[PDB]
Subunit: 274 residues, 4 copies
């Protein structure tokens, strides 16, 4: 059996996964959903031909997107996840007792449906009382929020649909508006090997509105280049100033209080981008 | 043109590079040598179907294998590189003034020959007076050395051919014998996602003979999983105790005095292996 | 979406089909069954990683295996299909009014099951009163038959399991035994580009027992090289001597009374094999 | 070594050849030339990512394009090959003593150059005194010819560049003009599985100007579907009326006097196209 799913992460480079069978294939109003069972990583979800998560390595992205900003915040209580259909970031947010309510907003309800069905270990906490799942825009949702959230984790850094975010460089100012006075927001910002421009631009644009703008790193083997990047915009708390007593035992497979600080130590060529 | 070179890094997973043309293809006494021109990474050298280096990302491996142990050592003067045919580690070793002589030992002279020819930016320093290039075993060379080297960077951790290294768990004790009383040695020790057993075993076996045994990390996009691992066996100096004044300006694209320490902060699942 | 199924028809050459989703994947007592939906050919069935049929091109094999021997026979009434799980040859056999009963014998009932389910246009006639489907050996079945069939269409030319066919070069003499005095048998005998030896051997071995041994051709785009070969062993009727009045209107997409004769005109290099 | 060259003969289907090394890669004024050494077929030439010929199967195309029209003609003496850079059709034309002069016109001189160098068994006769090689347009050449040729074998059926062929449906009438009063022309016209429209259109357009318009077939394993098609436009001689005494011993590996007629017996679905 030679059934392989290939992702050309670049016109000239990519990864190829051996597939045992497809679990669900569907063209949505928004994208092409494909849950597949791979031999190497277990069930893997692809959106528009690109890898979203897999059972085997999903923990890196989910833990690093959630825990760095939550522990940076002295006491996160109201959190927003935009575009986290698979529910993985929500699963990690719930490990923080301080969180009163975690809202999840994703335009595609079919991502949530099939993740609950085929990625139970990732989407199994969406049914939790502390979670409020909403199938809606997300960018529209941020546009309509005013100092409601302590931490906001965002999927895409480029709004599509109602770009009511007409603030200068709209999006980031839109997020600042939705965040409380000492809010924090995180956005994945690709890899430094094939799309380094994105890191420079986002880093500069976010800095225009947040006094604290840092960039951290993590290894995701299923993502382009194996090195993923995250931009953290903070209004008041420095992620590198976290008090040791602030941490508490939490079950993770990647994140560590030390990794928390070490993820901000960038390889020379990556610092050069900012 | 759809000419692609695929490396099945696992029976069920791999990377695929678009190739413009092959530069040199030859079956050696030792291995299958293939220099190829890739569109994404420039010239790339493959040995027995596996990626060795490429012009675009070679700097990570070369810098992290060389600089971590050299700066850990208060004053490296006599260094040995076993298996560094492409000459990249030698190129980095020469950036340290303290180095009086750097010996390179590789069984395949054809790797050295074609790297000089197609990877000039990597092999261009092998003609330097401070370098002594020897086309010979390497394991036999270590077996026949007695406290001659300050730092020894090793390619493979498993000796083939004359396994005269009959010391208990031979190899490492063989290396301790070739090293000076305060010597340091480094050996790449694969990735933690597909061959985690190797990290556990090497880490344990090296610890049996060196008082200091640490494991550090680096991102190599062309290597399995994007996260590569390195084992450092030290007889006296701690890589995490390097004095700030010890560092000096050196031209690198990845390595940093901070990366030096941060590379030893392991993701939770990786620490679990040791 | 870059999900492709590749068949290395040779260690150095093959075809690659874009897949939309898998329909059924199962490891049987006998083989690895994989029904898949391809974008180019519709549903396609693979057995042990090799293409069996597809909705788009199945007609060539089914028509040429069935019609050449049936029309060569002045009046076929009792026909046997060994290994025709997908029911395609049976579908074609039923277009001949003279056929009183068509027996289908296949070891894997799961091939019949899933072909009925996903290849209805091919397996839809297996429920016909004139058909007798038996999930059993096939070679054992031929070994236990004595002048019962007018025409026998065989899948593999090499018996596995009880090789009770101990007649000199057993199989063909076993088939002659199962055939009536003026019986005819047909067996696909691969392509002349990558496995030409098989054509020489079979042609010679069949000739040892049947006075008439011819080889005919057909284009199957999903099979190795695009040119497939069929061996016809006849005890009395010459496929090239068919009377014009013998033919009658029959619905086909490939086979023609003229193709009937033209399929036996071999390219120079193919004649050289026999 | 897993270096493979894939040709997506359709967005959803293709063939993949294992490559040992590239021989020559060059971007020409006209196209992307790639001579490559494959393990399965020997040296293979690709133009714009599509297979042109290979040492192993080149004989089919070359023989069937040449010999069918030459033997159909009672006495071919002046022959034109448009776009036969590799020189294979020329090699076959020279097997006919009646041919006084064979003109070859190809826009890309580099195809001729590298075919002579890497495909000697195909291009080795272009240095023959009876051959007149011209690196020039081809369509311009046909536009400027007036009853000069007995047989004209054409590469593409769609003129590019100076479309001075303004005759009704220009091209074919342009060819009739270049042909002598009893001339014959042949043009490959793809396969019936993926581009059947082309066969219908060309067949109809050619019939508009030649009293005799037939379509013949041949198996080329390296071309889409394994079944290639050829359109023959004749002003007077019927390719199916060739006298037996007309043939003479000629060395070929595919073509045969019988194949000559059998190639015109089309599978039912192919007849349906015309």
């Amino acid at each position: 059996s030679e059934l392989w799913y290939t992702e050309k992460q670049t016109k000239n480079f990519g990864i190829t996964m051996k597939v045992n069978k497809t679990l669900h294939t569907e063209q949505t109003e928004f994208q092409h959903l494909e849950m597949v069972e791979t031999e190497e990583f277990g069930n893997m979800l692809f959106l528009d031909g690109m890898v979203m998560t897999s059972e085997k390595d999903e923990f890196v992205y989910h833990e690093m997107v959630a825990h760095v900003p939550l522990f940076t915040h002295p006491n996160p209580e109201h959190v927003l996840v935009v575009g986290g259909g698979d529910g993985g970031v929500i699963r990690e947010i719930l490990k923080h007792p301080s969180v009163k309510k975690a809202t999840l907003v994703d335009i595609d309800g079919k991502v949530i449906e099939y993740s609950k069905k085929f990625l139970p270990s990732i989407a199994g906490k969406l049914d939790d009382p502390r979670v409020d799942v909403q199938v809606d825009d997300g960018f529209m949702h941020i546009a309509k929020s005013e100092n409601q959230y302590d931490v906001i984790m965002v999927d895409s850094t480029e709004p599509v649909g109602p770009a009511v975010n007409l603030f200068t460089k709209g999006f980031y100012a839109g997020i600042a508006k939705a965040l409380k006075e000492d809010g924090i927001f995180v956005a994945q910002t690709d890899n430094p090997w094939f799309t380094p421009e994105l890191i420079t631009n986002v880093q500069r644009d976010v800095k225009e509105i947040f006094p604290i703008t840092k960039l951290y790193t993590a290894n995701i083997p299923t993502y382009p280049s194996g090195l993923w990047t995250f931009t953290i915009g903070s209004k008041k708390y420095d992620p590198l100033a976290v008090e040791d007593s602030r941490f508490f035992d939490i079950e993770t497979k990647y994140y560590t209080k030390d990794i928390h600080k070490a993820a901000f130590v960038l390889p020379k060529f990556v610092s050069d981008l900012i």
